[PDB]
Every structure is written in C-alpha cells, then in structure tokens.
Design a binder for this molecule. Structure first.
Ligand code: NUP
Ligand code: NUP
Lengths: 215, 215
C-alpha cells in the first residue's frame, strides 16, 4: 500500500469523513472503513469513497458469525464494492472458510484477524492467537491483522505466517504503538485517531510517512 | 418474549423481510435483526420494523472490536432504535464494558454471546466460554446468548449466570437444535431459517409454538 499507511476512517459523519480522507489522500492508497461510518451513513459510502478517492477499501467488519451468516455478510460487503474484508479467526475454521469461499466467488480478499491490539485481548484471544494464525495458514489465508501494541506478538505472528503473507497492524498512535517498530514485522500500519482527530490530518499523515521513509 | 420465540430475520431483501415478519408477527414480540439485512437495506430498517410491527428489536451485531470502536458501534445502533445489542465476550472485559457503558447512557441492554452454536465454536470459543460467562457475571451482565446445539453447554452457562439472568439461544431448527430441550435452560429460542425459508412461515412458527406450549 502507498507509504505502508492505511487510514482507519472511523469518523461517523459523511462530511467529516470525506474532508479528512481527501486531505490525506496524497499519502495513502488504502482506506479501512468500519462499522462506525457504515452504520451511520450506509453501505453506499464504500462505493462513494472508492470512486471519489480511487483508493482500495478494506471493510473492517471483524466478521464473527456462524458460516451461513458469514457468507451473507461477506456477499453484501463485496456487493457494496469493498476490496477486502477483515474476519475474526476466534469463531473457528468453518466460519473463516465461509468468508474465503465468498471472496473466491467474487474475486476479493479476506484478512484474518489473529490477535487484537487492546488490553482485553490478553484475556482470551492472545492464548488462542498462535493457533488461530496456524489455522489461517492451513486454510490458505494470505492476509493477516495483528497488534502494533505488542511487537513481540506481531513478530511471533510473522514467524507463523511467513514472509510472503501480507500483514497489517492497528494500534499505532492513539493505542500506544510505534510506526517504525511495527513495520519491522508488518507490511503496513493502520492509523485512525492520530490522523483523523489531528488539528491537521495531512501534517499528521506526513509526519508518520517521514518516519516510515527513514526506516 | 411472546411465546418464548424470537425471529432471526436474516433475509436480505426488504420486501421479503417485511412479508415474512408480518406473517409471523402474531406469534412473536421480538425480532432479531443482523448484518445480512442491515448491510443490504440500511440501518433505517430497524426503526421501520419497530414501528410497523411494534416489536422489540435485538441488533445481532456480535460486537467484537476494541473498546473505543465498540462504543461507536453501540451508539449508532441504539440511535437507530435497537432495544438491545449482542456483543461478543471473547475480546475481553474492557470491550464488553464499553458496550455496557453506552447501553447505560442510552437506556438499552447488552446481550453477551458466550459460546456459539456452529461446529467451529469448539475450536477456541468453547474452551473460553465458562470464563467468558463468569466475566459477564462480574461485569453485571444480565442477558446472555448460548447454543441450542449443545444443551449440556447451555446448562453449564445457565449454572454460571443463575436463574435471574435472561438467556436466549440460537441454533434451533436448521442447525439441529430442538425447541423443547433448549427451553429447559434458555428463556427464549431464536429461530431463523426454519421459519423464514418455510413455504408457510406462519405455520412453521405456529408449529414451534405448539411444541413450546406443551412444555
Ligand atoms: N482492526 C482492528 C483490530 C485490532 O486489533 N485493533 C484495532 O484497533 N482495529 C481497528 O483499527 C483501528 C484503530 O484505530 P486507531 O486506534 O488508530 O484510532 C480502528 O478502526 C479499530 O476499530
Ligand atoms: N446470534 C447467533 C449466535 C450463535 O451462536 N449462533 C447463531 O446462529 N446466531 C445467529 O442466530 C441466527 C440463527 O439462525 P438460524 O440458524 O435459525 O437460521 C442467525 O441470525 C445467526 O447469525
């Protein structure tokens, strides 16, 4: 992705989301859109962004249902124009396979979320995360999400998935993660609030990129 | 809930969803709306249903994000008119607390999903599920979701949460669960496909209710 930086656009107002995304578009080629924006403004926002900005869109829906419902969610999301969807691995292999099947049908991609970035991830997810990652490898998953806030965990995840798999990582900035350290293991960093709540989002994005180029 | 039966309305077309829900409305007072319908027709469908049918709406969004994003998702969902939201417990206590805080702010309810009904739930969720349930109790959660497909698990969940907590249970019908056995432990059953894909949804709902009354 452009500059190894993916914008997490979690503003809940179309006008604000469009403003900020336009201001930082010169510094990214990929926007992650999640439920805060989608549930406030509608799924039509995905195609609007994809057209206006000519970006890739990752739908951060953390799909976490039974196989049959997962299929439906994925199909609706790809129909709306998303390039990729983020899926939880904790519901197990059949749930993940359902998403992979729809992605294969529709020429899209699945990102498997393996270990989350927030403190509560330590309670249940972290102890399962290596196994979840190995399950991804065994299902043929090629795209993964793991936590900027725990680079030792992010290193272990990279170790499991290998150097060919694509790994993106949230938790940079607001949650305490560091761009450069995260990029030792991840291919791209996800950044939300540190950009979209900044007084000058373009300057915030530029500052991050300047530290990325230095690596 | 009316007749201890909650409709899982996972049709993806507004016309079909309205038809079926209207046909079975005499047999329920509660409709569970999830992402298949919401992502296809918009969040405005929630208020439309609530008005047309005068039902309670549970938003089955299986909220599974970091605390900050969870807050946003819950707020958007309650703003749309949902009475309650289903939250995953696997992301840990801070993620659940974020949802509880918004529910307290907005006079709504959280349902904690503890153990899922599909086969893949055995891989990671089942081994954490008792702990997830105990975490719910310790957070003051009063409403829970557990699996019709494993009534021994559903009994253990009931044992942890006590007799005062409200427990609803999916996996009845299409996934193999039985109404009567499930209602030994759950207060209400969730039923989707066995009703909404039936040639006669009203007759399917009536048949289920007739077996519920017999208990
Ligand atoms: N996909 C995620 C997985 C995860 O482990 N943590 C995380 O924060 N996210 C999402 O990344 C973004 C983090 O944004 P920020 O902390 O930089 O504002 C938000 O959209 C989260 O909902
Ligand atoms: N909330 C859920 C938790 C769960 O463990 N299993 C489950 O199927 N659900 C949901 O309940 C409904 C099951 O519907 P059906 O199997 O009766 O069609 C669907 O909306 C699922 O997405």
């Amino acid at each position: 992705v452009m500059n190894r930086l993916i914008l997490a656009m979690d503003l809940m107002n179309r006008d604000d989301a469009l403003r900020v995304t336009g201001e930082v578009r010169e510094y990214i080629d990929t926007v992650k859109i999640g439920y805060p924006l989608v549930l406030s403004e509608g799924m039509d926002i995905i195609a609007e962004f994809r057209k206006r900005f000519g970006c890739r869109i990752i739908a951060d829906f953390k799909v976490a249902d039974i196989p049959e419902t997962n299929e439906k969610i994925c199909r609706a999301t790809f129909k709306a124009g998303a390039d990729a969807i983020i899926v939880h691995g904790f519901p197990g292999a059949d749930s993940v396979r359902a998403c992979l099947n729809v992605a294969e049908e529709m020429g899209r991609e699945v990102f498997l979320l393996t270990e989350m970035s927030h403190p509560g991830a330590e309670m249940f997810i972290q102890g399962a995360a290596d196994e979840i990652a190995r399950m991804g490898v065994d299902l043929g998953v090629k795209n993964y999400v793991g936590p900027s806030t725990r680079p030792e965990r992010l290193s272990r995840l990279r170790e499991i998935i290998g150097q060919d798999s694509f790994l993106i990582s949230p938790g940079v900035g607001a949650q305490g993660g560091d761009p450069g350290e995260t990029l030792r293991f991840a291919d791209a960093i996800i950044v939300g609030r540190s950009i979209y709540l900044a007084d000058n989002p373009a300057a915030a994005a530029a500052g991050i990129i300047e530290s990325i180029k230095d690596l």
